[PDB]
């Protein structure tokens, strides 16, 4: 779940 949230944070 950490990588998913981090990637979503980096995109937006």
């Amino acid at each position, epitope marked *: *779940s*950490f990588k998913e*949230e*981090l990637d979503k*944070y*980096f*995109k*937006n």
Partner: antibody, heavy 118, light 108 residues
Framework: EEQLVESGGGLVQPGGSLRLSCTAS????????MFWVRQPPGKGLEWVSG????????WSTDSVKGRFTTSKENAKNTLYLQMDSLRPEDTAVYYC???????????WGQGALVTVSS | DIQMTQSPSSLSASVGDRVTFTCRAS??????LAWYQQKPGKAPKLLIY???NLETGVPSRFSGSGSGTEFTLTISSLQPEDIATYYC?????????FGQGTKVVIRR
């Protein structure tokens, strides 16, 4: 304005414990992901751990998994690193790093030296 | 996982010379790449974000370019304040892997 301050460095016996604090004096510390990265003497950078917005999920590398825990307090604007069962390999300068969404790692601390020796 | 390889590992140039650092990627990372500068002892400073763009505060002599595998950091006019290690770091997929680093020494 945006400044990161670190505290808690010192000398700890092997197998001991130590708590590091990183206070953000410029921004909310909420809307930013945070990371802990150490640099051993004469050695390159080595990312250690990371914490998200709400502190619900954490990451730590396999070498320090289980020994190091990362927490945060947005009310006090402070990121905490609890280190347990220290080893001579953990002797390094520790840094707390911010992460902007689209940029990368922008602001770091001044560095807190942690030495593990008897 | 992605592997970042920099070249050259070290460099020696005189004042005012233009210098170029190349960062090769093991696979496609799009434009998610950053360049950081770190002096001995001090913390790394963000120099280039999104592989082409300039952070606030850093001087205008720093540049950036790269398509998907080969990224380039150029300093147009080398200055005595630029003695440091410059490293590229990817951000497309976690973990953010960094290059081995490039040392810069002035010849005077």
């Amino acid at each position: 304005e945006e400044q990161l301050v670190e505290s808690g460095g010192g000398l700890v016996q092997p197998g001991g414990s130590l708590r590091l604090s990183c206070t953000a004096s410029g921004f909310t510390l909420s809307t930013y992901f945070m990371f802990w990265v150490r640099q051993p003497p004469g050695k390159g950078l080595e990312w250690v751990s990371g914490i998200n917005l709400g502190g619900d999920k954490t990451w730590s590398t396999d070498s320090v998994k289980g020994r190091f825990t990362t927490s945060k307090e947005n009310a006090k604007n402070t990121l905490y690193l609890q280190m347990d069962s220290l080893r001579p390999e953990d002797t390094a300068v520790y840094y707390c790093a911010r992460l902007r969404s689209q940029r990368g790692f922008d602001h770091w601390g001044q560095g807190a030296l942690v030495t593990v020796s008897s | 996982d992605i592997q970042m390889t920099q070249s050259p590992s070290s460099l020696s140039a005189s004042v005012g010379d233009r210098v170029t650092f190349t960062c090769r990627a093991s696979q496609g990372v799009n434009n998610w790449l950053a360049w950081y500068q770190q002096k001995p002892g001090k913390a790394p400073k963000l120099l280039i974000y999104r592989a082409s763009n300039l952070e606030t505060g850093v001087p205008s002599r720093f540049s950036g370019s790269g398509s998907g595998t080969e990224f380039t950091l150029t300093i147009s006019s080398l200055q005595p304040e630029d003695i440091a290690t410059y490293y590229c770091q990817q951000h497309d997929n976690f973990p953010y892997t960094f290059g081995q680093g490039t040392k810069v020494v002035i010849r005077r």
